[PDB]
């Protein structure tokens, strides 16, 4: 519905989320929204809680997903595991790093 409405949730969440929340990691990722008009690139940092638009000078990992997909996720409806099974989220670069994200699919006691 709007790429902007997707990142907005990320910035609003990051500024409220905790560092210990996610897995033990720290770096930067390169997100890309696949659209018929092209591809919306976005920069995200793990270390801190910030968000930037464009292509990082040298991101740790490059992920490419569709707009619709990001909608179900960012909209707080679908789960990372679901989108992964479908194949909407494409990986490229340091799969090892990107893997840390999918790991969240697990159901542990403490995050």
Residues 87 and 54 sit within 8 Å (Cβ to Cβ): no
Task: Say if CB 44 and CB 61 are below 8 A apart.
Answer: no
Q: How many CA atoms lie within 13 A of 54 on its CB side?
A: 4
- Report helix angle 67-74 to 3-14, nearest 10: 40
Question: 34: buried, middle or exposed (CB in 10 Å: 19+, 13-18, 0-12)?
Answer: middle
**Every domain of the chain and the residues it spans:** 1-111
Q: How was this structure determined?
A: NMR
How many whole angstroms from its chain centre is CA 54?
A: 14
In the block, tokens 């690139």 appear at 41
* Alpha helices (H) along 15-108: 67-74, 80-86, 95-102
Supply the DSSP symbol for 103: G
> What region does 38 belong to: left with phi over 0, alpha with psi -120 to 50, or beta?
left
- The architecture of the domain spanning 1-111 is 2-Layer Sandwich (3.30)
Helix (H, G, I), strand (E, B) or coil at 72: helix
Contact between residue 46 and residue 29 where contact means Cβ atoms under 8 Å apart: yes
């Amino acid at each position: 519905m709007s790429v902007e409405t997707i990142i907005e949730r990320i910035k609003a969440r990051v500024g409220a989320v905790d560092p210990n929340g996610p897995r033990k990691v720290l770096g930067v990722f390169q997100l890309n929204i696949k659209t018929a008009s092209g591809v919306e690139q976005w920069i995200v940092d793990l270390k801190q809680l910030k968000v930037d638009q464009g292509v990082f000078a040298s991101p740790d990992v490059t992920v490419t997903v569709g707009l619709e997909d990001m909608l179900a996720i960012s909209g707080k409806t679908l789960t990372v595991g679901d989108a992964l099974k479908q194949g909407k989220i494409e990986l490229s670069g340091d799969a090892d790093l990107a893997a840390k994200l999918a790991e969240v699919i697990h159901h542990h006691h403490h995050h």
